[PDB]
Nucleic acid binder design. Structure first.
Ligand SMILES: [Mg+2]
Ligand SMILES: [Mg+2]
Ligand SMILES: [Zn+2]
Lengths: 81, 246, 49
RNA sequence: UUGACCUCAAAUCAGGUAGGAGUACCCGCUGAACUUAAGCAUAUCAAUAAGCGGAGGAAAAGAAACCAACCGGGAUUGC
RNA sequence: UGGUGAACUAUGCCUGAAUAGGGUGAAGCCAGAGGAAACUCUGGUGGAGGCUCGUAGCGGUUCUGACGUGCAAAUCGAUCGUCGAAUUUGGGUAUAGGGGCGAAAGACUAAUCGAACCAUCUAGUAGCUGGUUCCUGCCGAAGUUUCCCUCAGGAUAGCAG
RNA sequence: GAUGGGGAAGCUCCGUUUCAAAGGCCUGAUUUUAUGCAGGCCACCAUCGAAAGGGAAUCCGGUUAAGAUUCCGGAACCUGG
RNA sequence: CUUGUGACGGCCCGUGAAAAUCCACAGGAAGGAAUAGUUUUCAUGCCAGGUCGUACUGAUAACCGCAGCAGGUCUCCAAGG
RNA sequence: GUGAUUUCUGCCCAGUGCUCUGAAUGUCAAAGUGAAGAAAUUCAACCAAGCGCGGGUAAACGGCGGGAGUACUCUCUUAAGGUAGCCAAAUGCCUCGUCAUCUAAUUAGUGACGCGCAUGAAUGGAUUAACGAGAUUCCCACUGUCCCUAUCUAC
RNA sequence: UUUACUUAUUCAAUGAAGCGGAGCUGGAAUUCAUUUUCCACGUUCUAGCAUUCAAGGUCCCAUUCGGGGCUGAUCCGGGUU
RNA sequence: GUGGCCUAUCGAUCCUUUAGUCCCUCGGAAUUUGAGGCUAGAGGUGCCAGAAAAGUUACCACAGGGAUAACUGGCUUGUGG
């Protein structure tokens, strides 16, 4: 009974939500996220996972400060009014 | 081939010793000043059972000579020690059972136990139940003592090493048959995960050197060289002789 | 090379202990046999004479 | 006793700086096998892919412990 | 090559929990009797055992029953093994892929195991199988020679344009 | 599972009291006063880990379409000050 | 009958957690009364008790098995013959 | 490794392993030493462990023969020749072995026999109470398994 | 090949507490002139107790509430053993 | 008369080595060792136009094959009847 009766015993999560990415990939016993690598300082990325890099790279979010850097450069980082 | 069972034992994943119900390391009192210039008197408060150990332990209380407090040491109980007995530890201690005299100050034929190898490691030799060390001879110049060990070997150790006079309590245990796989289960359940033992000749050849074949047989000789490597040392390692002698 | 070994592990052996070990190993029997063979060689020459 | 020197510390001491992201191109380390040899082990793939460390608008290299053998040339880079 | 899994399951640890009613009647003890003494006998008491019949529970022997495009990628029915322990089990925790764990079947490691899964190298290689897209006109074969780890393949000569 | 350390080219690995100068505790004293200087005491030595282990203290009656040992009425208890 | 508990008895080469936390004792540091104090482990009296969860199912239809699947999934209460 | 108890575990160290505190130039690396050379280099001596020589070890892996004569004995051969036990056994080709028993009839069962293709002693041998969803044979009871089929209910 | 030496290196313990040398004070000791040495150098019927820079002695201070130094508890070398 | 009366009686590249020329080269210039070349032999591939090479799989896998076995059918009928 490795199929249907064994699927009834599944009610204990191995992963919960992660703090940096909100992914539900944070392993409870390992205390590590399997997608972004929290709590390591570097973010988990691999050159074989180029599509995953495309999924989580810069520009897939809000860019709350980086949207204005090109415009401030074009104006020359001016000050005043 | 796979990694065999005795090869897997050294990682210590499930092969660590079960130490939940143990009462502390049974060591001798440290050799500070009193034990090497005079003696010191302590008291046996209680004799208790140690989990996974065949011998009982003794809880001996001394006074700290430098601070107002009490020290509690765990000795291995000698056969004949009772609760409320005064235990004397030191160079000038009188020769009675339970006392912790150094080996330079006991005569020929003395039976001691919990013997230090070097002066100060707080007990190494003859600690299992019913075992003892006999003093075979002295050597004052180049101050050493010869001792007979429980294995029958004769060691030559320092005369400043200490030992508890008498034999370890709880002797004669292995004379009783266990009679039951349940009894062996409860015996090893508090020691470590090394039981039950599957024979390697009953395995598959991926799992052991002895495994495989259309009959259960070893194949080559079971005596293994000392220069063999891990994964090969399964059998009788470096056997000088085999068989039942008559 | 042999001397190094004897010093390393067999230094603390009383002669009585050593003799027992040698008998168990079977080294003693070999020494005796070698000597016996030497005696045999001399005996053969005498027989020819 | 007092005052130096040397060395080593402590401060939510005064002021600073490093980490992470990106990584097409750049500077290094580490490092395969599929494949080809009509098999295969040196070889090849390849001083490559994957992995790790570190920069900039370029980086690196760069003003000879050079090339030459000629009636000698003259930093580096690229075609 | 680099990562992800012990939510199933294997094993150890830590902390909890669960297990009707019967049968047999072990030590210890009490009374009576006998004996010269050792000690024996009889009647009770007591309630031992990896004992036994048998529920809940755990498992899965047979019908090679049902079903077999099923209720179900392993179930249903009857018959069964076991049922106070080497028992069953929750949660926490540890062991990760030539590695783990195994009362040992090459078993189990998320329906995947005589080496898991994911992505990349990778459009891996194939003397082997299958396919290969409009018309008309003209010419029109070979299965033979020699060499090859050659015998389902090539080179070379021949035949053809 | 950090730190002190020690490996590792490195991502990181070991170790958890270790070859560390590892800290805070009460009385106060002073009443330019702030909290130093009077003192004296103590050496564990991060932290995480149980909604079934340990653990301060609440019960009854009534009430809603849907909440209650939590609201209402009454009657208690514990902790800190 | 279910359950709680007490005093016992049997078993073991099995003798069947730890820490936070609270109390007591030994000790005698120090502070202390006579026109006055010393005591808040006695009684009464005063103030405050933050944050998050709290509905419902828990299974032949609320979970997992592609589903409103005869499967699987821990536990408490338990009337009469 | 073997697998409760009882009773035993015979012979063989030649081979393959394992192991010696033996004896010591046979094999004999790098470094080092010596000679020749102008030097690169060449040639020798010396030379650690391990091999090689000498022992031990079978509850280590394993092994346990022939030909004659009259159970016995002789001869050859080997490391030593199967001991105690057991058997057409789950191990026997021939084989449906031979004898007895069980039946009307038995390639099945059981008890014996043993030149046993190719049984055999911790590769464990023989025996064995109790136990077994283990394999096999016979007997009593019992029955639609069958002679030989018929009928009824629910879906 | 044997054999010193310790500071490199290595192992172990401790909250780095009693190391080494010399000296007292006793005992043995035979001294052949005066001491050569060697052992000691506060604890053993009893499941109590042992802590407040220590009492005492002594010397200062400015007496008072007390405070400090030496000794009690032998010197010397800072090599934790 | 350019081996055996005739028809069989044998071997590439790379590497090593020998003989000859004592000839050519070691590329800044020479001498001498050393090395590399040219011409002709030898060391050998017997699977003989010339890979350096043990098994097992009843746990097995892939690409194919009726070019190829284990059934029936078909031809034949030795053998059988
Ligand atoms: Mg186990
Ligand atoms: Mg085998
Ligand atoms: Zn994350």
């Amino acid at each position: 009974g490795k199929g249907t009766p064994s699927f009834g015993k599944r009610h204990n999560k191995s992963h919960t939500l992660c703090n940096r990415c909100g992914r539900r990939s944070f392993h409870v016993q390992k205390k590590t996220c399997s997608s972004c690598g929290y709590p390591a300082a570097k973010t988990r990325s691999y050159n074989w996972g180029a599509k995953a890099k495309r999924r989580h790279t810069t520009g897939t979010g809000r860019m709350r400060y980086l949207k204005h850097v090109s415009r401030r450069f074009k104006n020359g980082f001016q000050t005043g009014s | 081939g796979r990694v065999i069972r005795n090869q897997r034992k050294g990682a210590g994943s499930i092969f660590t010793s079960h130490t939940r119900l143990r009462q502390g390391a049974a060591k001798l009192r440290t050799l500070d000043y009193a034990e090497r210039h005079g003696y010191i008197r302590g008291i046996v408060k209680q004799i208790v059972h140690d989990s996974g150990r065949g011998a009982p332990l003794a809880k001996v209380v001394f006074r700290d000579p430098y601070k107002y407090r009490l020290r509690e040491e765990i000795f291995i109980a000698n056969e004949g020690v009772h609760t409320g007995q005064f235990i004397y530890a030191g160079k000038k201690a009188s020769l009675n059972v339970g006392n912790v005299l150094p080996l330079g100050s006991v005569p020929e034929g003395t039976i001691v136990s919990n013997v230090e190898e070097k002066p100060g490691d707080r007990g190494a030799l003859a600690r299992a139940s019913g075992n003892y060390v006999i003093i075979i001879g002295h050597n004052p110049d180049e101050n050493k003592t010869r001792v007979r060990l429980p294995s029958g070997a004769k060691k030559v150790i320092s005369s400043d090493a200490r030992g508890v006079i008498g034999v370890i309590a709880g002797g004669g245990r292995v004379d009783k048959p266990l009679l039951k796989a349940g009894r062996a289960f409860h015996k090893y359940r508090l020691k470590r995960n090394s039981w039950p033992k599957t024979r390697g000749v009953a395995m598959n050849p991926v799992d052991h050197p002895h495994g495989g074949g259309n009959h259960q047989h070893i194949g080559k000789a079971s005596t293994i060289s000392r220069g063999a490597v891990s994964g090969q040392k399964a059998g009788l390692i470096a056997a000088r002789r085999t068989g039942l002698l008559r | 090379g042999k001397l190094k070994k004897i010093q390393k592990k067999y230094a603390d052996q009383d002669e009585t202990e050593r003799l027992l070990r040698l008998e168990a190993l079977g080294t003693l029997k070999g020494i005796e046999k070698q000597q016996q063979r030497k005696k045999e060689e001399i005996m053969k020459r005498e027989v020819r004479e």
